[PDB]
Amino acid sequence: GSSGSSGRWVEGITSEGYHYYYDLISGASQWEKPEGFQGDLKKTSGPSSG
């Protein structure tokens, strides 16, 4: 509509193997965990792997 509601981040990995969170909104990045990130459930489960 006007602006994007709720936060949009995804947990991945960086150099070496550090679990970081990226931003799809525009394309931001941060080490720390974003506000109400909530992104980690059923790790490697079901049909969709990884």
Give the CATH number, domain containing residue 10: 2.20.70.10
CB atoms within 10 A of CB 9: 21
Q: Give the residue among 42, 44, 15 at the shortest CA–CA distance from 31.
A: 15
Do 24 and 15 contact (CB within 8 A), yes or no?
no
Domain boundaries, position 6: 1-50
Q: What are the backbone dihedrals phi and psi of residue 8, each rounded to the nearest 5 degrees, phi first?
A: -130, 100
- Structurally, how many domains does the chain consist of? 1
Gap between the Cα atoms of 22 and 27, Å rounded: 7
Task: Tell the residue number behind the tokens 């059923």, with chain if given.
Answer: 42
CB atoms within 10 A of CB 49: 6
Experimental method, per PDB record: NMR
Angle at 39 between CA 37 and CA 43, to 5 degrees: 160
Angle at 48 between CA 27 and CA 9, to 5 degrees: 20
